[PDB]
């Protein structure tokens, strides 16, 4: 009542295809194609949560420079004394985004904050 299979070849062609552009044996050699697959998914997690964290970082430093451009000692620190004291509903470090597109606008923001 032999019951032999082929469902491996599909089980495994699928992976064989998800691991393309893997530049070594990591793209040919099934028995390692598997663990590679696993490890790409894992780094997809860690790089995803770390991407939220990472883009905050990038905007903090970018807005921080735009503010320090005022030649007097301002900061990304003190800009937020003054940006929450005056009720501005959280421009969400995307004032760091216009700060590079509409810089004159960000100088308008900044002057209204100083008042």
């Amino acid at each position: 009542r032999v019951k032999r299979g082929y469902i491996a070849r599909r089980r495994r062609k699928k992976i064989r295809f998800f691991a393309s552009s893997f530049r070594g044996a990591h793209s040919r050699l099934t028995r390692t194609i598997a663990q590679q697959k696993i490890r790409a998914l894992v780094s997809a997690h860690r790089d995803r949560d770390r991407q939220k964290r990472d883009f905050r970082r990038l905007w903090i430093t970018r807005i921080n420079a735009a503010i320090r451009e005022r030649g007097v000692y301002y900061n990304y620190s003190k800009f937020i004394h003054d940006l929450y004291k005056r009720q501005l509903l959280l421009n969400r470090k995307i004032l760091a985004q216009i700060a590079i597109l509409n810089p004159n606008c960000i100088y308008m923001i900044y002057n209204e904050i100083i008042k």
Partner: peptide, 28 residues
């Protein structure tokens, strides 16, 4: 190990116009 996926049900809005921004302009 857990092979699981996820579809965030997004909504693709288009924006037609903007209105009532006349009051208290702070532009300069």
């Amino acid at each position: 190990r857990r092979n699981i996926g996820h579809r965030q049900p997004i909504t693709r809005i288009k924006i037609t116009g903007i209105t009532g921004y006349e009051d208290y302009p702070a532009s300069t």
